[PDB]
Amino acid sequence: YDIQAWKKQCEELLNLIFQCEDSEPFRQPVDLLEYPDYRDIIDTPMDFATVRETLEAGNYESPMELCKDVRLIFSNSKAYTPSKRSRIYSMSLRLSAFFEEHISSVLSDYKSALRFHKR
Ligand SMILES: CS(=O)(=O)Cc1nc2ccccc2[nH]1
């Protein structure tokens, strides 16, 4: 029932994600010199350094907000991919499975702690 525990749990999950070779394309904002049409396709770019910085700045109120930004990294990858077989898209699918597997308990514990707080 610790309402704040999600933050360190998210920091540790982001550390695991940065160690994972599948996060390489997503560790920093997309470079427009490499992908000049990126903003024609993607409304809201997102990457793991921006997620980490937002968390460390105290700019996420809940793990649901962090989850929404991480899911945006994966939906941007799916929207930009030229094919379902691309290297970077295949990396985002594995990384998404890894993220969803680990964020589930974080979200559950936070929501349970908040329901207890407001009982
Ligand atoms: C900096 S990035 O994340 O590699 C930009 C991007 N996102 C993609 C998704 C699929 C294929 C190529 C893609 N290039």
Can you tell me the distance from the alpha carbon of 7 to that of 22, in angstroms, rounded to the nearest whole number? 23
- To one decimal, the resolution in angstroms is 1.3
Residue in the block written with tokens 């799916």: 78
Residue in the block written with tokens 């903003």: 39
Residue 3 CA, distance from chain mean position:
20
> CA separation (Å) from 75 to 25, 67, 95?
14, 12, 12
Give yes or no for a contact between 55 and 14, defined as CB atoms under 8 angstroms apart: yes
Q: Given the CA of residue 82, which atom of ligand 1 is nearest to it? A: 11
Q: Given the CA of residue 81, which atom of ligand 1 is nearest to it? A: 10
Non-local CB neighbours of 3 within 8 Å, separated by 6+ positions: 110, 113, 114, 117
Please return the burial class of 32, using the count of CB atoms within 10 Å of its CB with bins 0-12, 13-18 and 19+.
Answer: exposed
Q: Given the CA of residue 34, which atom of ligand 1 is nearest to it? A: 1
- Using the CB atoms, write b or e for 71-99: b if 16+ within 10 Å: ebbbebbeebbeeeeeeebebbeebbebb
Can you tell me the distance from the alpha carbon of 116 to that of 119, in angstroms, rounded to the nearest whole number? 5
> Which DSSP string do the residues of 11-75 spell out, in sequence order?
HHHHHHHHHSGGGGGGSSPPPTTTSTTHHHH-SS---HHHHHHHHHTT--SSHHHHHHHHHHHHH
Q: Which of 88, 91, 96 to mutate to test the pocket of ligand 1 (most atoms within 8 A of CB)?
A: 88
Residue 82 alpha carbon to ligand 1 centre in Å: 9
Residue whose Cα lies nearest atom 11 of ligand 1: it is: 81
Can you tell me the distance from the alpha carbon of 88 to that of 70, in angstroms, rounded to the nearest whole number? 16
Can you tell me the distance from the alpha carbon of 52 to that of 89, in angstroms, rounded to the nearest whole number? 22
Can you tell me the distance from the alpha carbon of 87 to that of 95, in angstroms, rounded to the nearest whole number? 12
Span 1-119 CATH architecture = Up-down Bundle (1.20)
